[PDB]
Structure formats: structure tokens, C-alpha cells
Enzyme design. Structure first.
Site, PDB file in Angstrom:
ATOM      1  N   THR A 115      14.563   9.045  10.285  1.00  0.00           N
ATOM      2  CA  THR A 115      13.718   9.224  11.470  1.00  0.00           C
ATOM      3  C   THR A 115      12.327   9.805  11.127  1.00  0.00           C
ATOM      4  O   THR A 115      11.519  10.018  12.036  1.00  0.00           O
ATOM      5  CB  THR A 115      14.429  10.148  12.472  1.00  0.00           C
ATOM      6  OG1 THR A 115      14.726  11.388  11.824  1.00  0.00           O
ATOM      7  CG2 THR A 115      15.719   9.544  13.012  1.00  0.00           C
ATOM      8  N   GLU A 158      37.707  28.944  -5.071  1.00  0.00           N
ATOM      9  CA  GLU A 158      38.340  27.959  -5.925  1.00  0.00           C
ATOM     10  C   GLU A 158      37.482  26.719  -6.096  1.00  0.00           C
ATOM     11  O   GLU A 158      37.457  26.150  -7.176  1.00  0.00           O
ATOM     12  CB  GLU A 158      39.741  27.613  -5.418  1.00  0.00           C
ATOM     13  CG  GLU A 158      40.839  28.014  -6.387  1.00  0.00           C
ATOM     14  CD  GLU A 158      42.155  27.291  -6.179  1.00  0.00           C
ATOM     15  OE1 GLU A 158      42.489  26.403  -6.996  1.00  0.00           O
ATOM     16  OE2 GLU A 158      42.843  27.593  -5.178  1.00  0.00           O
TER      17      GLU A 158
END
Ligand SMILES: Nc1nc2c(ncn2[C@@H]2O[C@H](COP(=O)(O)OP(=O)(O)OP(=O)(O)O)[C@@H](O)[C@H]2O)c(=O)[nH]1
Ligand SMILES: Nc1ncnc2c1ncn2[C@@H]1O[C@H](COP(=O)(O)OP(=O)(O)CP(=O)(O)O)[C@@H](O)[C@H]1O
Ligand SMILES: Nc1nc2c(ncn2[C@@H]2O[C@H](COP(=O)(O)OP(=O)(O)O)[C@@H](O)[C@H]2O)c(=O)[nH]1
Ligand SMILES: [Mg+2]
Ligand SMILES: [Mg+2]
Ligand SMILES: [Mg+2]
Lengths: 425, 53, 345, 426
Positions: free
Chosen positions: D168, D243
């Protein structure tokens, strides 16, 4: 996100009145201000251009300005004349005599404060004002001189807002006076400094379209205004209907204006209609080829003589989005030299389901370096007279100095050299 | 093709090896934000000054 | 119509290709930094493949196949021959080679050298990054340690096919064009980079008889250009020598093996370099270098990613690149390359 | 416990956020009113109703207003939906400076209200675009402030990479470099979603002629769901935000994993006789299924994690991995173990009823840290270079208080990032 509309002078009020008649129809608003539309997708962003009054009436956020009552009396009587707020009609009695100096310095200076009082009132009643849009011509005196005076005063009071104009450029083919190059050069100097975006509507282009394309031998201002109102409708579709591209004046400016001074746009429209024309509905490939063609430009410039910095295409009506994307990609691949390589993906495309009128249409907005041809034409005409100081007495007689003319001429010549620099990049 | 199983409840996980190998402060942000704010204010002041001329 | 960019001025082949594109009224050359191109005649190293084919609606093609270096580099070719499933057990046409660093297959080379020494077999090896031919492992390894970067210890052929008259060594260079659809095309004309000195076993330091490098012959061979212009024999003169002296055609004794090697090499790396699943298309001209032994067996020596053509063949080869690889993707308004295929279709 | 707060910034972040929460609700059997006839408590809190631990922020109301009045209006608490009046006009400088300063403190307060309801906050998941003024500008300001107010908490990103097919703004390359530079130090792990890759997958695999944001967002939501499934189900791999960092991020700056998802099948197709493990595992190495357009064949791996969902047993996975290695271009860097971390969630994939995606018995999302993703930076950096050479559009940023210095500083950081991927990748 509200826009305050201002229309000044004969041209400004004539094209401005048509713009309001056109969009009022599109938004399902009748001359009394009441909504009677067959879609609500007309009222979703109606507040961008209309205020909401007492009995569910929608009133245009328009201010009508002129130094002569004539044109504004014609508006008040026309079809949608009753739609406007009566208090928003601000007019003087002594006109401007097609003199920029009279509109900017003498006659206009006497009327300007009362206009600003109406502008301020309309602005104070805005939840979040995006900016202003002015319709006017650059060849006359009120729209040209007083219009640029208004722009300057508004900018002082609202420096953090967007100033947009629809500026009708003068042409000998459709001329009112020999001093038009003076008025136009003086106005362009103001525009280069105080507007964020200007749509260059060239009377030369509008004439050549009516004459050569539509075969309207002997066109009238009404014929030129048919093209104008249609283009104005197309270029403002993204602001009036729910959309993602150039949905407001600022995003439009950010996408279209790479350099602050280079904000003069070349509009285009397809199909080129003639008041009361015949039967077919133009295929997407046909819409695309026409809107990019020199013959469909509202500015008398050959896009093949320059390069596009940015482009904004708008398609209206029910059509295949896949076909639109294919056609838009094809025009660029087939003419990639006419689009600057240093601005990646500089052609943006929007689609609106609601068509104008017609079953399907396409509006083009191009920031091309070929626009210098328009400024060169004016500069040539201006210099031919200024060199011999022809007709200067009308201007110097109002208080102006020759130095002001030399600065306006120089600033416009600089604008042309800047457009040429980016064409050679 | 070494495998190492770890935990098992609503599914399970493991690892398979094929081959072994071979802060700005709050003030610090506010200063930059206000430095830009003044540059904005200054540019607007220059514009209004030029319009006043 | 179509636009192209030239990002390698040193490429003699694509300089002629550029001229041929401009000779027609269909091609326009843009500045090397312009991204709105149709064809890219890219640079040898660090070509921007990631940026290719992302310009919408524009069809982009590049003169190189990304990842071809895993076949065109001396050490990576050795790695490919020894590790590819398509080549590891079937390759009988690549001389015994080991990668040597100053992975390191140094231990395996010494095991193979010691086996040939004790069995009384030929033990001459050639080391290349700077080329040393020797029958002493001690001498060969020390040579590598002195220079930086990875060398490859290849088995030296020892018994090559010698050209008579002159009794001289030679190598064959074949030009292979692989187009956008991975169609392998062998250019009809090849070149024999011959030596102008009689070949002798042992000594090795006489680089004019042991090394057939064109630059080695031009600067050090006193008989340079004695038998043929620029020490380059063509396939007509070579086919005539073969049919006469050895009573066998070139297109049976040598070309069948050449065609087999080319197809096996390019198809082993095909899944790793194929542009079907990429936004852009690729094509590449390769330079296959072969060496024929006295038993008429063809051996692949090296593969060149950016090869140089023979002066008289430039016009035909560059026109073939324009027609087969460029004009197939970008067609204009209105038998010199053999397409290499499998026995079955 | 370990809660997770999601922050959706700008149109892309908000609209993608809507799709993810719609999917999470379907996956956890949560109705639009919050009623649900635990692991999912890391994303939802409970009343007497399950309310998302999410905050929606945008400098303009129209998009968030759709949430306020939509099917899931009841799902969120009004304070979680924050809107301004004036957007950033696709300008990073407006989002970060001019308008950002005006709304930042309110946002941090609404976020603080969510953090105060957490027994043990893990961190944040920030959804935003690179191209929008809010998505780029406001997000980097928010990330800067979050690093101050929440020092040791993890911050993951889902960044929408610009694609011309749906772009855009012409200045999206500028906003992308500016936001990447400013946010780099403050993000622990970022999953880039190339709209071009999603666009093509929708066209190619779902037979959609011209994909809309709704089409794109539903596919994006599936990939996002696979990535966050481990946090919302007891799952044994990637159980916490930390993690993700340790299994996929070898160096702080190289924190952009490539996501590949399969299978993506059209809901109307019918020729489908269910794909097996190894068929879907093989698809993870087909460029046509990646979330970012690049060639992993020509990039070295630093990590490879396979996340399976549905009918999958280890035997099949191991056999699939064994074969794939012998037929694919999987090259790891010489300083890393050439191994795959595998995770299986027995919960089968969920699809939105009346959606473009077909319901499958098994699916897999692969998260791999490959140097091939640097191609995405190269494309962006090149577009930035083309415009910046002429200073095109720069006046819009300078006009908002920025300096040309920030443009070259951000570009120099991107040049260093491209070089870091080069050093690792050889
Ligand atoms: N996939 C996807 N991309 C989107 C969506 N909405 C916007 N985008 C992309 O996001 C970019 C524009 O940024 P947005 O997030 O819309 O802008 P914003 O954050 O609202 O910023 P401003 O409008 O400048 O205040 C473009 O690249 C769009 O294609 C969406 O729902 N899905
Ligand atoms: N195993 C081998 N047996 C016999 N001759 C060999 C050989 N390897 C190389 N040669 C000879 O050495 C020459 C050069 O070989 P090499 O493979 O190094 O050349 P090249 O064209 O790849 C480039 P460079 O200039 O780096 O040597 C060959 O043309 C050939 O004459
Ligand atoms: N397109 C268009 N141009 C007009 C119209 N009226 C005047 N012009 C042009 O505008 C210029 C004259 O300015 P005008 O608006 O008449 O005068 P003002 O009252 O001083 O602003 C000339 O260049 C005319 O060709 C009109 O209705 N339409
Ligand atoms: Mg006027
Ligand atoms: Mg006028
Ligand atoms: Mg927005």
C-alpha cells in the site's frame, strides 16, 4: 477524517459545483441534503466531505468564495444549489478583473478575513481534520490570486495539515484574457511552496480531448467541465469510499510526492465520455490502455517525453481483479523505460465496486516528469510578454513590483529544471 | 542416526543427530524522542516565520 | 522489446553475445545497476540471485545457474564425484583424487600411495590449487604446505594419447550450454589444447610437454604454433588423424564417452540447481576439460563455469547462446548443438 | 505458571491477530462469548469465560472497530483494544515519534494491567507489519520501552514482510529497514512472513485467483498456530519462549527462522487421499511451501526443528528424515550438529469452517535457521538503496523530526546483518 473544501472564482465555483453534484449523486444525497441511497458502503465515509445537520441532513463541508456575486448566484439556483450552507457563501461586489494582483493584494485582501472565519468554523467542528482541497483556475483573478492568498493564510493557521488543490491551467485555445500567463506563473510560484498536492487540470488538454477525441468541434466550458467533474470524482474515490490505498490526503502525498516541490499530478480518465453519449462497457484491457495513453491525460503533456516518478490507478465497477493486475503489470512491462527504476513498485492500483454514470471506469493519477511541458508552455508565454513588460501596468498599478514577477518566473524555471534532472536520473 | 527422547504427554519430542560438527535507559529514549520533537517544532517555527515575512 | 544488463565486462563470450543482442532491433542494454531487466549477464562471483524474478510481471533470466560451483570448483568436483549417489559407484572416468589442506583426505591419499608403491603400480600424482607433477608423496605434500588454500591430489594419467607427428600431449575442451528447461546442448565444435613439445615420461619439470595449458605453451614452448595455429587443433583435423592413424572415428572412440560424462555430471547436480520452483530462470555455458589415455579412454579433468571460447568459434557459439538459451525465453517477432539425452525417452 | 501476552500493532498485526485468536478458539473449543464447555491458560485467562491475554493497538480506529463490533467482540475486554485518531500515514517517523509519543504510555499501562494478572509471565509475542507507519514505527518504540519496563522477559515477533502484490506504500522498504534496525537489539526471535510467499501459496495451492487479506491471514494463522501450539498444549518441544531462542538462535542478531508449512490443500479439491509423513516432511524442503521467498538449497542451516500435528508416530518421522537427507540439499554450518529437533502434538490441525483450507489428518511446520533468509534482507536493502540514493521521500521523515543520519545508521546495521549471514554461511 474530514476535508474542508474551498472553491474560489468563476472556474473554481463552476467545477466545484459540478464536483458536488457528481459526488452527491454517488453518495445518494438529493438536492435537499437527504439520503436516499441503495447502499451503505455511500454513508460509510460520508463525513469526509459532508457534515451531519439537525434532521438527518448531510451538508457539504464546502466554502464558496468569489469577489463577484454572479457565478455564486448561478450556483445557488442550479440543481444542487440548496445543498450548501448559506452562511458558507462569502462574496464581494467588485470583482477581480482577471487580475492576480487584485485577487491577492487589493480586492481579495479585503474579503479574505471573512472567508477564514468560515474556514475556522468548519475546522473547529472537525473530529480530526486531514486538510483542505481548493478548486480554482490559475488564469483568472479571484481563484488564481485570492485562492493562493487563502492557501497562504490557511497554511499559517494550519501548518500541520495537507493542502490539496485542483488547479485549472490556462490555454490560448480556451482563453479569457492575454494576461493569463502572468496570473498562472504567479500562482504556480505560490503552489510550488504552499501545497502538498496539486492536480494539474489543463484547459489545453481538456480542449484537445473535446475537439480531437470526442469530435466536439466548438466545445464549451460545460464540455470541459464534464471531463473535470468526472476526473475529480475518480481521483477522490479512495477518500470517499472504504479502501486501503491513498485512503487519506497524507498517505496519498506520501505515496505520490518523492520531492517536496514535485507535487503536480497529471490526471487521466477512461472512457472519455461526451455529455449524452452512447451501448458498450469497455473491457479491463481497454480501460488500462486508454488511461495510460497521452490522449486521455488532463494535462497537455506527452508522458513518452518524460518518466513517471509515481502512479496511482483506480478502477471502478464490477470487474476481474486478476485481469486488472495482469493489465496493470503489462503496461509497465511494455513501457518499463517510462517508469523510474530507482523507485521500486511506483505504480499502485486500487479498485472500487461502486461505479460512477458508467458500468466501469478507470482514473489515472501520475506524477510524471513530462509535466514540465505544461510549465514550459506557460513560462514561454509569460516570458514573451514580460520581456517587453507588456500589460505590467495592470499589476504594478495594484502595488506589485517587477521583482515579484522575476522571482515567480525564476521559481517556475527552477521547477522545470528539477523535473528534467529526475528525468535524466 | 542418534536419537534422544525428551518428555511425553499430548504427543512427544526428541532430537535426532546425523553427524557432529567440526540496553538504552528510559531517559536515553526520552532524550532522542524530545530531540526529534524540537526539530519538528523548529521546522514549523521556520515555516511560520517565513510566512510572517 | 527486451532489456538486458551486462555485469561482467571481462567475459569475452558474453561481450560478443551483448553485441549480437544489440544487432537486432529487439534488445536494449540498460545500466548494470538497473533492476528492470529481462536478461542478466551477471558477474562471476557474488551474483545477486536473491533479487532475481521479484519484479512483478517481468520475466527474468540469468546467464548462470546458482550452485554450479559444486561442480566447477576443483575441490567441490572431487567431493561431488566421491559422494553423489549418482556418481560414487558408477564413476570410472574421473582420476583418483583427494582433497588436501595445508575434512582433509590426507590420510586416505597416503594409504592409496603406499598400496601402489608396494604393488609396483604407477605412482605419479599431480597437485593443483601452482601445479606439481611427482612420483614422491613426500615432495607432493610439502609443495601443498608451502602455498595457502586447498590443493587436490589427482592421479596423473601417465599414459596419454599422443598426437603424431610430434608425439605430443593434448586435452579436449567441450562447450556445453544448459538452458532454462535443463536441456543439455553440446557444441558441435571442440578444441584440442595441444602441446608443441614431445611428451616424455619422468622428468616432469618440463612444463611444455606435461602441461597443455595455452598460457604455458605460448610463453614457454619454443615450438608454439608449429603444428597448428595457437596450439589449437579442431575436430575436423582430429577426426582425420583418428580415422587415418588409428582407424576409428572421433564420434565413437571419444565423443560417446564425452557425451556420457557431461550428462552424468550435470544431472547429478540437477536437483540442487534447478530453477523450476524459483521465480527466475537460469542458463549456463560450461567448459568441460577432458584427457584421452592411450587405450582411447576419456577422463574428465575439470569443469569451467565461465569458459573462454576459441577465436574462430566465438561467432557460432555466441549465436547458439542467443538462439537456444535467450530466444527460447524471449522470442523475436518471426544443427550446431547436439541435445544430449538418455538412451530411453 | 508461564503466561504469554500477545501484542497486535497496526492493521496487519490486528487483522492477523483476529485470525489467530479465531483459530485458537476453535482449537481449544472456546466459543466467541468466551465460554468453554491448564496449558491453554498461557494464552487465555479465566473468569466464572476465557479471555485472550492480548492487546490490540492501532493509531486509527476503523480496523480495531471491526473487532469491537464483530463476532469476537465479547471475547476481548474493552481496555485491551486501544485506538488513536490519526494514523502514521505509512511513515515510520510518525509512528515512532510524532504520534507514537502521544499513545505509548497508555499502551504500556494497558499491557501492565495484563502483566499484573500473570503469576509468571514468560514474555510477549508482537505482531506487526514492516511496511505500515504504525507497524514499523510504533512497534519499535514499543519494543524499546518493553525492554526497559520488562528487562529479562522474552520478546518474539511475527513480522509481515512487504510484497508489491498487496503493498500500500512506496516507502515500505524505508520503514522495513528503519524498524528492523531499531528493534534488532530488543527482539529475541522474529518470524518473518513474506506476503508474496503467502500470496503465491494461496494462488498455487488454494486456487485463489486474487487472494484477499482474509485469505492470507487464515493461512498465516495456521503457521502461527503451529509455532505457538507447544505453548498452548502440554507439548514437549518449545515449551516456553526462551526455548525458541535457544533451539533456533545461535547469535543474538541471527534470530530470523524460516518457517515452512505443509500440507496446504484446497477445501474443494476432493482428489486428496491423505498425505503421509515423509510426503509432508518432504514438502518442508520444497521452496513453494516456505513463508519467506528464498532458496534454502543454497544456504547453510544452523538449526532445524520439525513440529508435527495430528496422526504422527516417531517411526515414520525418523524414516522420513533418514530418506530426506540422502535426497536433499541439507547443508549445515561446520560449527553445528547436523541434527533435527522433532516435536509431535497429537492434537490434529483445525481449520475454520467454511474456509479455503481442507481439513487434514496430519501436518508439519518446520522452523529452520538458514542463511538463505538473508535473501529477503538483500531484496529490501536493494530497494532502500535505489530510493535513498536520490533521497526520494526522505523529506517526509525529516519533516517529522528524523535525520538523514538515522537512515544511513539503519542501513549500515542492515549491511552488517547481511555480512553476519555471509560469515556464518561459509
Ligand atoms: N498479510 C497481511 N498483510 C497486511 C494486512 N494488512 C496490512 N498488511 C500489510 O501491511 C503493510 C501496510 O502496513 P499496515 O499494517 O497496514 O499499516 P499500519 O501499521 O496500520 O500503519 P499506518 O497506516 O501507516 O499507521 C503492507 O505491506 C500490507 O500488505 C493483513 O491483514 N494481512
Ligand atoms: N590427472 C592428470 N593427468 C594428466 N594430465 C593432467 C592431469 N591433471 C592435469 N593435467 C594437465 O595439467 C593441465 C592443467 O590442469 P588443471 O586441471 O589444473 O587446469 P585448469 O584449466 O582447470 C586451470 P589451472 O591454470 O589452475 O591449472 C591439463 O590441461 C593437463 O594437461
Ligand atoms: N475548465 C474551466 N475553465 C474555466 C471556467 N471558467 C473559466 N475558466 C478558465 O479560468 C480562467 C479564468 O478564471 P476565472 O475562474 O474565470 O476567474 P476568477 O473569477 O478571477 O477566478 C481562464 O484560464 C479560463 O479558461 C470553467 O467553468 N471551466
Ligand atoms: Mg477560479
Ligand atoms: Mg482565478
Ligand atoms: Mg493503518
Amino acid at each position: 477524517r474530514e476535508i474542508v473544501h474551498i472553491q474560489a472564482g468563476q472556474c473554481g465555483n463552476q467545477i466545484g459545483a459540478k464536483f458536488w453534484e457528481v459526488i452527491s449523486d454517488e453518495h445518494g444525497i438529493d438536492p435537499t441534503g437527504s439520503y436516499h441511497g441503495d447502499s451503505d458502503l455511500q454513508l460509510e465515509r460520508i463525513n469526509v466531505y459532508y457534515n451531519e445537520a439537525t434532521g438527518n441532513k448531510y451538508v457539504p463541508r464546502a466554502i464558496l468564495v468569489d469577489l463577484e456575486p454572479g457565478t455564486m448566484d448561478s450556483v445557488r439556483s442550479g440543481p444542487f444549489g440548496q445543498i450548501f450552507r448559506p452562511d458558507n457563501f462569502v462574496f464581494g461586489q467588485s470583482g477581480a478583473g482577471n487580475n492576480w494582483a487584485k485577487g491577492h493584494y487589493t480586492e481579495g485582501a479585503e474579503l479574505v478575513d471573512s472567508v477564514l472565519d468560515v474556514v475556522r468554523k468548519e475546522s473547529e467542528s472537525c473530529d480530526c481534520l486531514q486538510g483542505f482541497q481548493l478548486t480554482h483556475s490559475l488564469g483568472g483573478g479571484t481563484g488564481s490570486g485570492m485562492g493562493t492568498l487563502l492557501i497562504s493564510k490557511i497554511r499559517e493557521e494550519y501548518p500541520d495539515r495537507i493542502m490539496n488543490t485542483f488547479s485549472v491551467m490556462p490555454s490560448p485555445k480556451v482563453s479569457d484574457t492575454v494576461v493569463e500567463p502572468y496570473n498562472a506563473t504567479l500562482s504556480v510560484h505560490q503552489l510550488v511552496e504552499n501545497t502538498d498536492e496539486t492536480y494539474c487540470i489543463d484547459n489545453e488538454a481538456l480542449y484537445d480531448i473535446c475537439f480531437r477525441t470526442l469530435k466536439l468541434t466548438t466545445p464549451t466550458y460545460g464540455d470541459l467541465n464534464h471531463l473535470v467533474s468526472a476526473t475529480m470524482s475518480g481521483v477522490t474515490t479512495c477518500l470517499r469510499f472504504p479502501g486501503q490505498l491513498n485512503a487519506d490526503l497524507r498517505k496519498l502525498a506520501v505515496n505520490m510526492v518523492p520531492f517536496p516541490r514535485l507535487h503536480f499530478f497529471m490526471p487521466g480518465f477512461a472512457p472519455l465520455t461526451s455529455r449524452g453519449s452512447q451501448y458498450r462497457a469497455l473491457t479491463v484491457p481497454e480501460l488500462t490502455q486508454q488511461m495510460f495513453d497521452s490522449k486521455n491525460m488532463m494535462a497537455a503533456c506527452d508522458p513518452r517525453h518524460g518518466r513517471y516518478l509515481t502512479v496511482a490507478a483506480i478502477f471502478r465497477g464490477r470487474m476481474s481483479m486478476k485481469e486488472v493486475d495482469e493489465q496493470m503489470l503489462n503496461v509497465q512491462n511494455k513501457n518499463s523505460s517510462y517508469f523510474v527504476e530507482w523507485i521500486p513498485n511506483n505504480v499502485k492500483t486500487a479498485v472500487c465496486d461502486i461505479p460512477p454514470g458508467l458500468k466501469m471506469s478507470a482514473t489515472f493519477i501520475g506524477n510524471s516528469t513530462a509535466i514540465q511541458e505544461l510549465f514550459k508552455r506557460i513560462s514561454e508565454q509569460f516570458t514573451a510578454m514580460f520581456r517587453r513588460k507588456a500589460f505590467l501596468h495592470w499589476y504594478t498599478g495594484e502595488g506589485m513590483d517587477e521583482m515579484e514577477f522575476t522571482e515567480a518566473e525564476s521559481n517556475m524555471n527552477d521547477l522545470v529544471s528539477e523535473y528534467q534532472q529526475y528525468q535524466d536520473a | 542416526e542418534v536419537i534422544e527422547l525428551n518428555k511425553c504427554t499430548s504427543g512427544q519430542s526428541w532430537e535426532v543427530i546425523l553427524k557432529p560438527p567440526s540496553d538504552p535507559s528510559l531517559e536515553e529514549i526520552q532524550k532522542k524522542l524530545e530531540a526529534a520533537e524540537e526539530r519538528r517544532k523548529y521546522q514549523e517555527a521556520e515555516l511560520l516565520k517565513h510566512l510572517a515575512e | 522489446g527486451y532489456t538486458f544488463v551486462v555485469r561482467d565486462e571481462n567475459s569475452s563470450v558474453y561481450a560478443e553475445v551483448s553485441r549480437l543482442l544489440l544487432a537486432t532491433g529487439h534488445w536494449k542494454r540498460l545500466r548494470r545497476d538497473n533492476p528492470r531487466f529481462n536478461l542478466m549477464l551477471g558477474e562471476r562471483n557474488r551474483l545477486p540471485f536473491g533479487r532475481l524474478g521479484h519484479e512483478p510481471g517481468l520475466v527474468q533470466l540469468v546467464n548462470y545457474y546458482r550452485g554450479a560451483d559444486k561442480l566447477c570448483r576443483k575441490a567441490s568436483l572431487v567431493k561431488l564425484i566421491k559422494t553423489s549417489p549418482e556418481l560414487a559407484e558408477s564413476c570410472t572416468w574421473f582420476p583418483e583424487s583427494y582433497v588436501i589442506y595445508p575434512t582433509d583426505e590426507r590420510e586416505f591419499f597416503l594409504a592409496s600411495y603406499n598400496r601402489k608403491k608396494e604393488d609396483g603400480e604407477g605412482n605419479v600424482w599431480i597437485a593443483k590449487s601452482g601445479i606439481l607433477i611427482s612420483s614422491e608423496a613426500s615432495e607432493l605434500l610439502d609443495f601443498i604446505d608451502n602455498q595457502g588454500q586447498v590443493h587436490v591430489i589427482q592421479k596423473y594419467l601417465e599414459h596419454p594419447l599422443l598426437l603424431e607427428p610430434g608425439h605430443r600431449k593434448f586435452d579436449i575442451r567441450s562447450w556445453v550450454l544448459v538452458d532454462h528447461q535443463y536441456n543439455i546442448y553440446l557444441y558441435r565444435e571442440g578444441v584440442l589444447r595441444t602441446a608443441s613439445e614431445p611428451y616424455h615420461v619422468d622428468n616432469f619439470q618440463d612444463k611444455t610437454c606435461h602441461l597443455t595449458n595455452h598460457c604455458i605453451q605460448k610463453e614457454y614452448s619454443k615450438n608454439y604454433g608449429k603444428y597448428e595455429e595457437g596450439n589449437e587443433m579442431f575436430f575436423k583435423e582430429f577426426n582425420q588423424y583418428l580415422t587415418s592413424a588409428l582407424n576409428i572415428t572421433l564420434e565413437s572412440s571419444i565423443l560417446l564417452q564425452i557425451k556420457h560424462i557431461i550428462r552424468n555430471c550435470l544431472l547429478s547436480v540437477e536437483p540442487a540447481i534447478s530453477t523450476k520452483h524459483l521465480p527466475y530462470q537460469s542458463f549456463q555455458l560450461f567448459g568441460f576439460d577432458f584427457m584421452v589415455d592411450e587405450e582411447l579412454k576419456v577422463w574428465l579433468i575439470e569443469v569451467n563455469g565461465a569458459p573462454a571460447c576459441a577465436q574462430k568459434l566465438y561467432a557460432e557459439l555466441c549465436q547458439g547462446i542467443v538462439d537456444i538459451a535467450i530466444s527460447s525465453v524471449f522470442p523475436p517477432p518471426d544443427a550446431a548443438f547436439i541435445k544430449l539425452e538418455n538412451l530411453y525417452f | 505458571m508461564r503466561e504469554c501476552i500477545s501484542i497486535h500493532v497496526g492493521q496487519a498485526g490486528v487483522q492477523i491477530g483476529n485470525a489467530c485468536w479465531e483459530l485458537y478458539c476453535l482449537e481449544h473449543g472456546i466459543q466467541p462469548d468466551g465460554q468453554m464447555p491448564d496449558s491453554f491458560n498461557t494464552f487465555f485467562s479465566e473468569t466464572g469465560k476465557h479471555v485472550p491475554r492480548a492487546v490490540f493497538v492501532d493509531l486509527e480506529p476503523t480496523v480495531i472497530d471491526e473487532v469491537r463490533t464483530g463476532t469476537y467482540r465479547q471475547l476481548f475486554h474493552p481496555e485491551q483494544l486501544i485506538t488513536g485518531k490519526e494514523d502514521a500515514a505509512n511513515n515510520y517517523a510518525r509512528g515512532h515519534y510524532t504520534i507514537g509519543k502521544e499513545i505509548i504510555d497508555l499502551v504500556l499501562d494497558r499491557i501492565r494491567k495484563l502483566a499484573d494478572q500473570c503469576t509468571g509471565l514468560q514474555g510477549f509475542l508482537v505482531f506487526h507489519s514492516f511496511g505500515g507507519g504504525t507497524g514499523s514505527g510504533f512497534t519499535s518504540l514499543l519494543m524499546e520501552r518493553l525492554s526497559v519496563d520488562y528487562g529479562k522477559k522474552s520478546k518474539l515477533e511475527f513480522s509481515i514482510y512487504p510484497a508489491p502484490q498487496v503493498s500500500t506504500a512506496v516507502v515500505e522498504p524505508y520503514n522495513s529497514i528503519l524498524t528492523t534496525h531499531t528493534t534488532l537489539e530488543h527482539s529475541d526471535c522474529a518470524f518473518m512472513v513474506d506476503n508474496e510467499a503467502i500470496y503465491d501459496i494461496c494462488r498455487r495451492n488454494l486456487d485463489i485467483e486474487r487472494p484477499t487479506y482474509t485469505n492470507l491471514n487464515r493461512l498465516i494463522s495456521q503457521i502461527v498456530s503451529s509455532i505457538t501450539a507447544s505453548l498452548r498444549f502440554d507439548g514437549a518441544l518449545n515449551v516456553d519462549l526462551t526455548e525458541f531462542q535457544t533451539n533456533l538462535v545461535p547469535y543474538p542478531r541471527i534470530h530470523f527462522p524460516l518457517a515452512t508449512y505443509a500440507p496446504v490443500i484446497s477445501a474443494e479439491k476432493a482428489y486428496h487421499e491423505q498425505l503421509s509423513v515423509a510426503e509432508i516432511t518432504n514438502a518442508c524442503f520444497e521452496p513453494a511451501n516456505q513463508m519467506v521467498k528464498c532458496d534454502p538449497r543454497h544456504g547453510k542451516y544452523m538449526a532445524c526443528c520439525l513440529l508435527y500435528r495430528g496422526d504422527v508416530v516417531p517411526k515414520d518421522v525418523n524414516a522420513a528424515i533418514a530418506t530426506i537427507k540422502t535426497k536433499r540439499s541439507i547443508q549445515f554450518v561446520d560449527w553445528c550438529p547436523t541434527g533435527f529437533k522433532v516435536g509431535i502434538n497429537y492434537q490434529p490441525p483445525t481449520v475454520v469452517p467454511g474456509g479455503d483450507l481442507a481439513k487434514v489428518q496430519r501436518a508439519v511446520c518446520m522452523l529452520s535457521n538458514t542463511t538463505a533468509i538473508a535473501e529477503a534482507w538483500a531484496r529490501l536493502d536493494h530497494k532502500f538503496d535505489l530510493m535513498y540514493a536520490k533521497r526520494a521521500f526522505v523529506h517526509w521523515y525529516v519533516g517529522e523530526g528524523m535525520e538523514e543520519g538515522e537512515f544511513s545508521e539503519a542501513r549500515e546495521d542492515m549491511a552488517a546483518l547481511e555480512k553476519d549471514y555471509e560469515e556464518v554461511g561459509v
